[PDB]
């Protein structure tokens, strides 16, 4: 049953205090599926990546059971099913340029190697002030987890490359064979 | 004079995790000369062994030109540092291509890949009398940091190669569809 | 700036009192009775389908 609701790139204001923030394009991947202690809990996963840096991998994994606390702390007004649906709605809207909002990501230290987390925020600028719409703490991944990520994406695109070899090979042949039919129609 | 992949292919290898019974698997073999070492200006030979069915199966022997004389004496080799990878690869390519009578073997120092930190790679000749060993190389399993680079490297590679095949498909799918519409109208005439 | 803060604050609150605002006012004390409290948090809240969005505190 797992399902990716969003997988795209978006400019994000990343900040490693006390350094000055700087805008980078970042990957956003959001996927629902199954996990937890006994592997039968519904999960929502939020994943943040940097195409310019393979080790830049921050994730929030949310188990359905922990959600009531989550909904309360963040004052959400949707159930576990709508949360990732609205989150990607909000984020995709920003990435699409249809949003007045901007994306921000603040790490808990001045360097990436010493950080273990970041707070990703959806921010609105008004004349009065920046208004915060949502806040999520994302944890930086551990190596073993990370190896899987790379290895996962490694295996993924290797297949996808081969698949395009198959598509190129079949369609090259169909339409190349079509020249010969329509060559005889020209002869007519 | 400049770095070079001398070999990058797949070949059947007899893999053995003692005390378990050996088993034959297809393994990746990559052999590359280039620059490396303590000060990064030493000529190196790299031998890399992989398993397409297993991303963590990543074993390497890295050899520095400074270290080679010991290597040469110990293994009773009769070529210099420059010829060694050409002949190693000569031998391996002969095997992968099927032109060799020889076989490949890889024996781990433990019962699981997870518990190993090394393996011995051997080129073996079967005779009526006995197995005759032609060469043996110990390869070390990589530390996490090394491996993450390998995966990330291969990650970025095939992501691009995929993108390129979309471009190639786009070229051929679009032109040839454009040709169908032209000559389909020529049939209509 | 300091000059605008009360203008926008009052802008926001006055907007609410007149009924021209979509926003609501909230006040949460640090205890269960007024006699034991010494403070409260006053918030301007926006209701969305997704969540309450806080505008000022």
Numbering used by the authors:
A (entry chain D): 130 to 317
B (entry chain C): 129 to 317
C (entry chain E): 208 to 264
Question: What is the paper's account of this structure, in its own sentences?
Answer:
SAS-6 organizes the rotationally ninefold symmetric cartwheel, an early assembly intermediate of centrioles that participates in establishing their symmetry and diameter. The cartwheel is organized through the homo-oligomerization of the highly conserved centriolar protein SAS-6. High-resolution crystal structures of zebrafish and C. reinhardtii SAS-6 fragments together with biochemical and biophysical characterizations demonstrated that two dimerization interfaces in SAS-6 mediate this oligomerization: a coiled-coil domain that forms a rod-like parallel dimer; and a globular N-terminal domain that forms a curved head-to-head dimer. SAS-6 is a highly conserved protein that is found in all eukaryotes that have cilia/flagella during some of their life-cycle stages.
However, with the wild-type construct of Lm SAS-697–320, we finally succeeded to find a crystal form of the space-group H3 that diffracted to a resolution of ∼3.5 Å along the l-axis with anisotropy limiting the resolution along the h-k plane to ∼4.2 Å. Using the structure of the Lm SAS-697–274 B–C homo-dimer as a search model, a molecular replacement solution could be found that allowed the subsequent placement of the coiled-coil part present in the construct. The unit cell of the Lm SAS-697–320 crystal form contained three 9-fold symmetric SAS-6 rings with three SAS-6 dimers constituting the ASU. These three dimers were highly similar to each other and overlayed with an rmsd of 0.88 ± 0.29 Å in secondary structure matching with 357 ± 14 selected pairs. The inner diameters of the SAS-6 rings are ∼19 nm and correspond well to the diameters of cartwheel hubs observed in vivo. In the crystal, SAS-6 rings are stacked onto each other. Neighbouring rings interact through inter-digitation of their coiled-coil domains in an antiparallel way. The ASU of the crystal contained six SAS-6 monomers that are labelled from A–F. No clear electron density could be seen for the distal part of the coiled-coil of the A–B dimer, probably due to the lack of stabilizing crystal packing interactions compared to the C–D and E–F dimer. However, we demonstrate that under high protein and precipitant concentrations, a L. major SAS-6 construct crystallized as ninefold symmetric rings with a diameter very similar to cartwheel hubs in vivo; this provides the first unambiguous experimental evidence that SAS-6 is able to form ninefold symmetric cartwheels on its own. However, in our ring structure, both of these critical interfaces are similar in their orientations to those observed in the crystals of the Lm SAS-697–320 F257E and the Lm SAS-697–274 constructs that did not crystallize as rings.
